[PDB]
Amino acid sequence: PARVAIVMGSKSDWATMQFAAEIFEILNVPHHVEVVSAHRTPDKLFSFAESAEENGYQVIIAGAGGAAHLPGMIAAKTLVPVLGVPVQSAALSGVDSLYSIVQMPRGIPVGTLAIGKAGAANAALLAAQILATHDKELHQRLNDWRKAQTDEVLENPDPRGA
Amino acid sequence: PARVAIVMGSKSDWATMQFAAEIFEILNVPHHVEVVSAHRTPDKLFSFAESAEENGYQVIIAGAGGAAHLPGMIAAKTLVPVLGVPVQSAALSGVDSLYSIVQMPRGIPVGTLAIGKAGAANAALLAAQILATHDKELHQRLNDWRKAQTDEVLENPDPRGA
Amino acid sequence: PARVAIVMGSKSDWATMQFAAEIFEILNVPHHVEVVSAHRTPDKLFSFAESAEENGYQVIIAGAGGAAHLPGMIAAKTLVPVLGVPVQSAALSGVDSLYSIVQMPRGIPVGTLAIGKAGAANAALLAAQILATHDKELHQRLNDWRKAQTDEVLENPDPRGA
Amino acid sequence: PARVAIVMGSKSDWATMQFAAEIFEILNVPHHVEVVSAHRTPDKLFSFAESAEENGYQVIIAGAGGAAHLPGMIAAKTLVPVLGVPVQSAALSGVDSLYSIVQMPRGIPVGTLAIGKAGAANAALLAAQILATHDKELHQRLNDWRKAQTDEVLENPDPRGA
Amino acid sequence: PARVAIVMGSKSDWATMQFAAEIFEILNVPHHVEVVSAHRTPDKLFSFAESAEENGYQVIIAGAGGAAHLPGMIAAKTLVPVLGVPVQSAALSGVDSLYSIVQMPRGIPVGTLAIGKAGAANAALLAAQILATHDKELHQRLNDWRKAQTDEVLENPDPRGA
Amino acid sequence: PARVAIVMGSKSDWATMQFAAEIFEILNVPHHVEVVSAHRTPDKLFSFAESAEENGYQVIIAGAGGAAHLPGMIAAKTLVPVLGVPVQSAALSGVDSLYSIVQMPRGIPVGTLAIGKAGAANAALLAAQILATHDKELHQRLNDWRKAQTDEVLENPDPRGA
Amino acid sequence: PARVAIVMGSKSDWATMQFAAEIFEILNVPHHVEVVSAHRTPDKLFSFAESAEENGYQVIIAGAGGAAHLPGMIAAKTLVPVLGVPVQSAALSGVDSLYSIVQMPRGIPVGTLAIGKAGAANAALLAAQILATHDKELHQRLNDWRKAQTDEVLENPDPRGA
Amino acid sequence: PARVAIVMGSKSDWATMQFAAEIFEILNVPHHVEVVSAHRTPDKLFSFAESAEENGYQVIIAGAGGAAHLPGMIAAKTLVPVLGVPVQSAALSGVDSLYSIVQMPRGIPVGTLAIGKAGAANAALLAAQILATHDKELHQRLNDWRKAQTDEVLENPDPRGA
């Protein structure tokens, strides 16, 4: 059963959000992926958020750029935790995306990650850490993955040419 | 019949939006005022936008601060022209408000005005200019008001003490 | 009869503003296009704005970059509604364009759209929505166009490879 | 048993973080509060993070301003989910706090909330939503609290004087 | 004969521009002061700039805030050198004023000074230096004034209490 | 006799400053060009500024990027008018260059132009306008050049393909 | 013998730089304090930097705001290590001060500290750490001071009221 | 004996930090180079900083990008002077790197250099200047290197083609 859903405002956002799905493939975490536009499919946004709890989602990762309203509007319609990923926009390099997501008012939170691909991957890792609190097997896989990243850096201390 | 509606995300926004209503009092333009929160009353936002055309509104002026989603979400749900006013936020001085409103994607526009009270007043003036295209009497009142502002500056060229 | 005029500060601005004209071709809205420079042809700017109402324009879309004075100076010379499009500048990525257009003082409004091509397209859509208030046929075409955009997203929910 | 810990870099941060504790008092959520400085008590930071899981914490809310390293360094030392609150700094108004917290690299996430008191309150609400996934009673209290906020706005639509 | 004119967009700008006039009083430089609004008195702006050379002005100092179009539009209408002073705006602290003035395109220059009162004083000093090139007496007064400022700093090297 | 000197911090700045020299070639204005580094040749900077008046310079155009100290330090050492051109830096896109030049304190002015090549060309035009005040022939050439730029825009009003 | 010199651009900078002197009083480090203006006393700046090594200075702490040229120009004239403190400016809140100091080009470094009073204190601490490398007694005093700061935080973990 | 250590958060940082090592090769200064990640190898960071004094390091140059915590966390764990180099990040062009490093609180300083390669080279030059205070031979080599840079600019005053 998919306990996490990855949503984005447009198909072009996949170039960024694919990095969230990559973490789940590595950690073997079942997940749903779907394009839900706050501005082009506002009604679908409402129906998606309203049925999130019933559909079994415990965490929702939402990505959007520019006037990024997707994460916040989903968070306004459900109690399921929402994590937001600011997609890098052309002109403002994601600052508009960042401000539109992180500056939510008291009462409707959205846990925001870094701008771009690093944030997409981290949103998945955070979702995994949340799930891992009640999933011993996943907790172990996260632990092993973290150790693997640390060891790679430790066994290669000199960045200069051989 | 009220052809324009002034909406805002919170009652504290009235300190800013009251300047939009002031322009309408001066120009004798019937208007509706209401608090519609994108995050605290998402369902009311949808019902307000869906019935805007039927309620007779030809222009909607929406004000919000921070992660200002109100103008854009209304614009996504109706063909009635939407004008957005960025309320000045504490930490980011309205830059977050500005970015969240003006950076709308292709297909769902929001005509954005200046940050703060100047923008609120201008949103009302712009709405009035739009209405004035098919209202000769209002067009005349706008003309007289503009002349009055120009004359005040012209009859007082020296800013120094008397 | 052309009820909307698209003006820009330089011919190089056409790479951006062509997206406004594209919306009008799609919606079958007669329009005028012309290069009017606030700094290189200041007198032409004044004559263009002064005769706008008599020439039948109900909405004026003006695009400019850098110290973008074109939209505001036109708005200062006519009661015809003015929509401004900030062209993306090299060094400041359109922030200078945005500030010079959106920050107009009380009394002379300019409805501002997003930086770049998205804003150009949206300025045309907003102008169309304004016209649609008194044009049932255009209102229907806008409605059908919006439905077409929504349906495209709805019939393609999975962004991943086939 | 306290399932959430609220930590901050300095005692002066309490003026902001007290709003996180307020949400927990309202929702009846047991919590721990402590000053842990990344720069003045680096060793305590490591010991706090290392024992977080054993101490029963399922969510950690960390607040800091300026070169805000506290949230990220805790996240680097534990798998327990970390939420970060950017405290508003004097000179940069929290932009430095925001960048130092949200821009974490791939592998070590920190779910970031808004700058200031709104973010502190939201970090607590997000932590509550996370806990609510496996706590039916808390889920109900969150639901009732949200309804109460919505109703207050709905029963007071006119912001003007009586 | 007044060889320099100090103009500003509004009477409220005098709180800033008075510092330009102060330099001229100190240096005994005849000057004209007047409120010329680019947006409220566009026609007066054109007539002022067109007659500047005939009126004997060799330098024009123009101050404005927000969407500061005054300096640039004057520069577009005359060959008399124009110096611009960005007035500090509330929300954007003069960054909008600065961008709207300094970013002029190739062909129409505006020599820009610092944001606020320091810039107003410096615009007058720069105008004085320009005049001083062909005015030996003024050149001497500028020299003596500069020496006086240097000496004050030199005779007070210790900033601590006596 | 060269009445204007064009100086820059490094030879790589020539890619930008060459546009200032281009204006002088077009207008037939004798000029000096030289690399004077505030940081690599501080003593040469002082000797250049000290002898500027004696060498016949009436205007000095100085270009620099990053921590752009060149214009201001020259202005601190001479009464000859100094115009500054902010060169576009890689990381901050000239904002650091702009701030380091335009924000000069009361007493030592630097007339600042736009970031990059547009500013370089404009600094030369401004210098020319300053000289033109006492040079009827140059004033005429500037007039003809401006007319030529205006006419080019006027005879090509339609930006679309033929 | 004073091994460190604290210099600033103006006497008003003392409100900030006094915090650097405070650290030296606490640590018992002999120091010189003087007002040296890059723009008002350029010649004094050169003589101060040229004689720094001969006067026994091993570290120079320089503070300035706005177009902060003082630190960099001193660094260009001496091999004695220079530390820069950005004073908080009114309009740009020290961002101009920060950029003008930190962005020095290859060859002439300035170790930059935080904006404002925190940076002033830290510049003194850094200077002390540099001296401490060859001064066992000072190294011990720095150690004891750091322990004292850590202990204060450790003995007061609960920020709430008693 | 290596008196300086160059550390960085990731191997990809070497493209920037190699310019620090280049200065040391030119000046013949023994140095250590190593990858120490604040987020991926937090324990190694602590052990590296704790043993820095015993390992003979008198200056530590640390480079990092994004949420750049490396320099500050090292500085919190040792009295050895720490110099920080902000690596240029993709989205924010090093502004996040700069803020996370320079804004350190009172008590734990980090001398910060420019964003990118210029800063890396300057951090090495500053470290060299610090060492040169007690190393006459190195002081001479630094002097000769500086003279060489100055002479290159002096013998090539004309940037134009031959």
Swiss-Prot record, chains A, B, C, D, E, F, G, H:
Substrate binds at S10, D13, R40. It catalyses: 5-carboxyamino-1-(5-phospho-D-ribosyl)imidazole + H(+) = 5-amino-1-(5-phospho-D-ribosyl)imidazole-4-carboxylate. It holds the Pfam family AIRC. InterPro entries: PurE_ClassI (IPR033747), PurE_dom (IPR000031), PurE_prokaryotes (IPR024694). The keyword Isomerase applies. Pathway: Purine metabolism; IMP biosynthesis via de novo pathway; 5-amino-1-(5-phospho-D-ribosyl)imidazole-4-carboxylate from 5-amino-1-(5-phospho-D-ribosyl)imidazole (N5-CAIR route): step 2/2. Coiled coil: none annotated. Keywords: Isomerase, Purine biosynthesis. One of its GO terms (biological process) is 'de novo' IMP biosynthetic process. SUPFAM superfamilies: N5-CAIR mutase (phosphoribosylaminoimidazole carboxylase, PurE). Its EC number is 5.4.99.18. It is an enzyme of class 5 (isomerase). It comes from the Bacteria. GO terms for molecular function: 5-(carboxyamino)imidazole ribonucleotide mutase activity. Catalyzes the conversion of N5-carboxyaminoimidazole ribonucleotide (N5-CAIR) to 4-carboxy-5-aminoimidazole ribonucleotide (CAIR). Belongs to the AIR carboxylase family. Class I subfamily. This is N5-carboxyaminoimidazole ribonucleotide mutase.
